[PDB]
Chain A
Amino acid sequence: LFRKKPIQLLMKESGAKGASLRKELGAFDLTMLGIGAIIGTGIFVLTGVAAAEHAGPALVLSFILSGLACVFAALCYAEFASTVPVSGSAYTYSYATFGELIAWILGWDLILEYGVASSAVAVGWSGYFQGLLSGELPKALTSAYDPAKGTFIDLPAIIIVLFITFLLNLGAKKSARFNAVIVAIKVAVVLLFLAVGVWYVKPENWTPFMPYGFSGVATGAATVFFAYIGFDAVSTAAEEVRNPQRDMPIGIIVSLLVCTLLYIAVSLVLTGIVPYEQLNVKNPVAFALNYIHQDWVAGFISLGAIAGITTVLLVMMYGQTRLFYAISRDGLLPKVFARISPTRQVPYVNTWLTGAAVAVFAGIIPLNKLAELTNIGTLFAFITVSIGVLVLRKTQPDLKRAFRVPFVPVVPILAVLFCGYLVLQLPAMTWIGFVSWLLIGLVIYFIYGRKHSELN
């Protein structure tokens, strides 16, 4: 059940995959990788709805609490990327520290999390694409999820997934320079909203600071936690990094700490321009600029959001596909094969099927539910890795660690407590989907999962 995977074995698979691949990537390229995976739908969309219905102007404290939970968690991931510098996240770490049973549960949870996160990202993207087009407007009933009045499907959200699914299937190799271009488009547009929006900030809009009390700051924090998911993606590039033991921890923590500051500033400027009660909009940042008659800058920020949110979508789908290739190689799920040449067949993952699943949920499920369901799965993964550092310090203490978590028990415990606190802040119905999904996975392990590449 708790049969651990030796770190030596994880080095061999990473060393076989990254033998051909060229190494250039440094601390800067990995910070871009991190920022690219972090800034997206969370800050561009969730921030509006969360300020209007959960915290109000106090959404800034809701970003601090939520931001602190991720810092303590990211510090744990950095110790893991320093110690096990292989192309892989939480699934690989749990397999080395806890063992097969914990790695399967978390693994199966993240198959859902990356899928559900892609739908939430694509729903957010749609609201910015629709907002930009008007000023145009498509058929009224193909603009959002199925409610009681109007809309049936969110067609732009269905379409963007299919465009991303077509790109990943085209097999076009990644360019670190091209990623520096898009990440700068995203960073510059955020700074532009801050620099232009500061002039129109009415401190009157901040006066009823905590209208929903601290209870509202806490539920708000569980929502806007989503915006911080993405720092784990720095482990992808491990087979292309010269010295990954000290560059990947830098990338993880730096990309996170940068975004936390932008996030605090965006919250203040947003609630400062528009009264909290008017921010429940599909495009809050474009709306705030339109509210104060900066129409040209608003469209320019809508463009940056479209291009910038698209990179979040590509990462999420890739991280899921990579995760399916890892679970099946370990024998915990069956092996699919497809001919790469007319006479040469290799292991395959059906991206058209994994992408179709995402496209459907993106077109029918409201953003809030999708985000809340990603938040539960991610918080439990974060708690697992945090304890993983402690378990790896007790068992296997001799391992080389270029980066070490500052305070040996305290910080990993704090991450467990802060994340644990945010889990208790999510709606009760969010547990129905998450738990039932885990029961399905737990059944899979006893029937199939015990017929894998470590039973021997």
Chain B
Amino acid sequence: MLGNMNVFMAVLGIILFSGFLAAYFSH
């Protein structure tokens, strides 16, 4: 645990960063 919480939180943020980025560059 703890590391598993941080690991979870970090990938949400990575995907939500990449997602919001790609969403901005669309018609």
How does the 8 Å CB contact mask read for B1-27 relative to A, with 1 for contact and 0 for none?
101110111011001101110110111
> With the chains together, A296 CA to B15 CA distance in Å?
13
Contact A187 B12 (CB under 8 A): yes
A175-192 residues at the B interface, CB under 8 angstroms: 176-177, 180-181, 183-185, 187-189, 191-192
**Interface SS of B by simple majority:** helix
A393-428 residues at the B interface, CB under 8 angstroms: none
A138-191 residues at the B interface, CB under 8 angstroms: 176-177, 180-181, 183-185, 187-189, 191
* A residues near B26, Cβ cutoff 8 Å: 293-297
Contact A29 B12 (CB under 8 A): no
Taking residues whose C-beta sits less than 8 angstroms from the other chain, chain A's interface range is: 20 to 34
Question: Closest approach, in angstroms, between the C-beta of B26 and any C-beta of chain A?
Answer: 5
Question: Closest approach, in angstroms, between the C-beta of A199 and any C-beta of chain B?
Answer: 9
How does the 8 Å CB contact mask read for A1-28 relative to B, with 1 for contact and 0 for none?
0000000000000000000000011101
- In the complex, whether A32 has a CB less than 8 A from a CB of chain B is yes
Known contacts A296-B22, A297-B23; A28/B5 CB under 8 A: yes
* A residues near B19, Cβ cutoff 8 Å: 188-189, 192, 195-196, 297, 300
Question: Closest approach, in angstroms, between the C-beta of A344 and any C-beta of chain B?
Answer: 35
* B residues near A185, Cβ cutoff 8 Å: 11, 15
Q: Which residue of the partner chain B has the closest CB to A299?
A: B22
Q: Which residue of the partner chain A has the closest CB to B14?
A: A188
Q: Which residue of the partner chain B has the closest CB to A175?
A: B4
> With the chains together, A187 CA to B19 CA distance in Å?
13
* A residues near B18, Cβ cutoff 8 Å: 300
* B residues near A195, Cβ cutoff 8 Å: 16, 19-20
> With the chains together, A187 CA to B4 CA distance in Å?
15
> With the chains together, A294 CA to B19 CA distance in Å?
11
Question: Closest approach, in angstroms, between the C-beta of A181 and any C-beta of chain B?
Answer: 6
How does the 8 Å CB contact mask read for A281-321 relative to B, with 1 for contact and 0 for none?
00000000000011111001000100000000000000000
B: which residues have CB within 8 A of A? 1, 3-5, 7-9, 11-12, 15-16, 18-20, 22-23, 25-27
Give 4 A-B pairs besides A26-B1, A32-B4 with Cβ atoms closer than 8 angstroms. A29-B1, A181-B7, A192-B20, A297-B19
- 3 A-B pairs with least C-beta separation: A188-B15, A184-B11, A192-B19
